[PDB]
Design a protein around this ligand. Structure first.
Ligand code: HEM
Ligand code: HEM
Lengths: 448, 441
């Protein structure tokens, strides 16, 4: 009946126990001590962390709880606006864009993005093929170069050309700097430069995207990107199309929501494979057997089952957008024991949910892709790396198609060496990534 | 591409080869002679017996094959109904009960059953402590007393009190008579009376519990309170009765057989017995073992897996092809064709275990991640694998651990292994003498 809660230290509340830049990892250790639910207070606020499948299945009931805009999401809203990720469910533009954009994010729609994904995936393979004998790869950096360029191309037919540069395209530099500022504001005279830079980064992002939308409207061109879809879609409900300013926010939103979650997934999967050579061999044997043409077809990506299983198991251990927030829509009782008032906040701690031993067995820290061999047998709401319900990741099929395609190509074309005996270091921002992960590849010399 | 087949006898097909008291052992000799796959026919039935890890790993692919209700399970369904073990995977009650019960059979859930398991284990150890100098133990008989009573207490908080009797509680007599009758069919008046004795007792305990509202640590409390996450429905009272009967039927003899074969293998290999007893002595430092202490009995757990490797006490399971498919690139099957997995022969596959397959060497399980996927399957496969696996191992680890802490054992008759076959396997007539080390219990 009373909710477990870590030790409080006078006016500081539980704040002294989070003196870190890795709060999710610190919170998982607190969940290991106090269990499936605990309240966490700091001078400002109060939140309740949930870790078990049994309480997370209740918090996922949409007639009772809806998505909350955390303080992180409110700061990201200054440049992401009322795009799908930083909007409340009750805003008119949330529902309109949701209805309009769902059909363009389905499994079927992936058939139309496939060729543009293969385009960027071939540039990464060629980069690694062209490395001299004494070089090495910076994994998260290269994967991020790929995901930004793929989202840029599929989203609005724009080429950032990240594999041609040491310093990213100006849009990327401003987006990433705006994101970093939004997150650094969470732990905050001498910030006047931060403020002027943040306003400059917003105008760089808006001007470019507003220009491409206007350029596209003036030409009449039709293309296979999300921008065409939004220029010609109408919400079946209200009958209206999205307006130019909201399309710009969705474009920014695809990039900020998709770039590091997907690059982090590819980097953690490759980390798990080089630390588990037998798994790597089985995944590499599948890629060799399935990817028989010079470049993969859509249908061949769909048949890389074990590669998909490695990706889901990497997402089970380190889900790359690790926590999401919800509010009680009305007074209610959680799990028969914890009363909540309307407006009370809950946080879903995904990595801990994914280590619930009543679901997965006692061996939760082992990397075992075989856990996903039969997807129909994973219990309802046990695996939630893409969030929940109508507010779940609209880009889920896009992210799995992209990662399955790329990891398959990586395993086909190269052998990998963990030449530094890399020690895992998980940096936390809006997302997770294995900071400083580095490998050497040896080409299998298979022509593209 | 052509599959071997043992001798046929006209319209009797291969049936007559199974007119024996030890059919799985007859099947192993046929597997020894024909290899990794053979066809076996009866009047209007066909099945293919698999023995090699290479073919059985494909058989365990759930997108291609699902559990089949063999003739034995259809006879056990007359009293086990639509409980978990005798239901098709596509029956609504199979999924309902599975979703609800899964979390109550997890390793974590064993912490809630540990105290009642200890209650019955201590009753077994005390019986042996109280034997006089001129006495011996009947192993499988005492192990079955223990597993029936533990499943009865942990499943529905009911005491059979098998250590207070020469003749078992009446439910137990009807259940073992009913199982025997279903196995002999591969009578009718007695069979119907025995079903009724089982349903009357189990239906009464369920109606008593709902009337009182008491909440206890058993499986029945879980079933009265659970709701299937998918449909939102509870199990009804009839199905709850079938699950209780099913736990008793599926768990009692497989688990007591495992305990009997482990002790047998230990008295025949004294250096392994002494290494297991030295672990028990170092870990079980309290007069009442704790849940955490049982988990530290690693070599005892390896002795039990090695006993299950040689004589897996539920030795064969049946599968059917979901769609037309080819097995191992050589054997084309049609939708509905049946496969039988011969577990003892799988566990003797020299290409996985080495040439010393007949030797008892617990050290083979030192590194559990080194055993290839589908090489070791005493609990069946996938979503239709034994839901009781954690329960069975905690129980057996707890009990063997206690045995080795408290007694020294003598194979006083120099017992000659004789494996009796029913639904399960056991070492019939296995007897030993135990001398107490006089340690507080
Ligand atoms: C493996 C990669 C990814 C992961 C783990 C991931 C995870 C998530 C999560 C957990 C949410 C819900 C956030 C919340 O409840 O506050 C979300 C929402 C969202 N994601 Fe993803 N994401 C990934 C890739 C992508 C990609 C590739 C795109 C787009 C190209 C994308 C676009 C979105 C959008 C637009 C939303 C908001 C949807 C709505 O509320 O209507 N994500 N994602
Ligand atoms: C050493 C002990 C045991 C062994 C070797 C064993 C073996 C097996 C095997 C081989 C199966 C699969 C049968 C098939 O494929 O048709 C099975 C299923 C099952 N077992 Fe066990 N068993 C043991 C103990 C137990 C215990 C202690 C319980 C209950 C407390 C139990 C309850 C069940 C149930 C309910 C099923 C059917 C599950 C389903 O299909 O959903 N068993 N067992």
């Amino acid at each position: 009946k009373e909710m477990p809660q870590p030790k409080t230290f006078g006016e500081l509340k539980n704040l002294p126990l989070l003196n870190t830049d890795k709060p999710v990892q610190a919170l998982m250790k607190i969940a290991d001590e106090l269990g499936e639910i605990f309240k966490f207070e700091a001078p400002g606020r109060v939140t309740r962390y949930l870790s078990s499948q049994r309480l997370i299945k209740e918090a996922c009931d949409e007639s009772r709880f809806d998505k909350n805009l955390s303080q992180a999401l409110k700061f990201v809203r200054d440049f992401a606006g009322d795009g799908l990720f930083t909007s409340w469910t009750h805003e008119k533009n949330w529902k309109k864009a949701h209805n309009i954009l769902l059909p363009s994010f389905s499994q079927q729609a992936m058939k139309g993005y496939h060729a543009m994904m293969v385009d960027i995936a071939v540039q990464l393979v060629q980069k690694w093929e062209r490395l001299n004998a004494d070089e090495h790869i910076e994994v998260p950096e290269d994967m991020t170069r790929l995901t930004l360029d793929t989202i840029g191309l599929c989203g609005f037919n724009y080429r950032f050309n990240s594999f041609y540069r040491d310093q990213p395209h100006p849009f990327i530099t401003s987006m990433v700097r705006a994101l970093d500022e939004a997150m650094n504001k969470l732990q905050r005279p001498a910030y006047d430069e931060n403020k002027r830079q943040f306003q400059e980064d917003i105008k760089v992002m808006n001007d470019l995207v507003d220009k491409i939308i206007a350029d596209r409207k003036a030409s009449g061109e039709q293309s296979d990107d999300l921008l065409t879809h939004m220029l010609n879609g109408k919400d079946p409900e209200t009958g209206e199309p999205l307006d130019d300013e909201n399309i710009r926010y969705q474009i920014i939103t695809f990039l900020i929501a998709g770039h590091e979650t997907t690059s982090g997934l590819l980097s953690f999967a490759l980390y798990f494979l080089v630390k588990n050579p037998h798994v790597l061999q089985k995944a590499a044997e599948e890629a060799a057997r399935v990817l028989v043409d010079p470049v993969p077809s859509y249908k061949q990506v769909k048949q890389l089952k074990y590669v998909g299983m490695v990706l889901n198991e990497a997402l089970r251990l380190w889900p790359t957008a690790p926590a999401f927030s919800l509010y009680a829509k009305e007074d209610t009782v959680l799990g028969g024991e914890y009363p909540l008032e309307k407006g009370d906040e809950l946080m879903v701690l995904i990595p801990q949910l994914h280590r619930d031993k009543t679901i997965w067995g006692d061996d939760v820290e082992e990397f075992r892709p075989e856990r996903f061999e039969n997807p129909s047998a994973i219990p309802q709401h046990a695996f939630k790396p893409y969030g929940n319900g109508q507010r779940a990741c609209i880009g889920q099929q896009f992210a799995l198609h992209e990662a399955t395609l790329v990891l398959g190509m990586m395993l086909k074309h190269f052998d990998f060496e963990d030449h530094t005996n890399y020690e895992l270091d998980i940096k936390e921002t809006l997302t997770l990534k294995p900071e400083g992960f580095v490998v050497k590849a040896k080409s299998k010399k298979i022509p593209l």
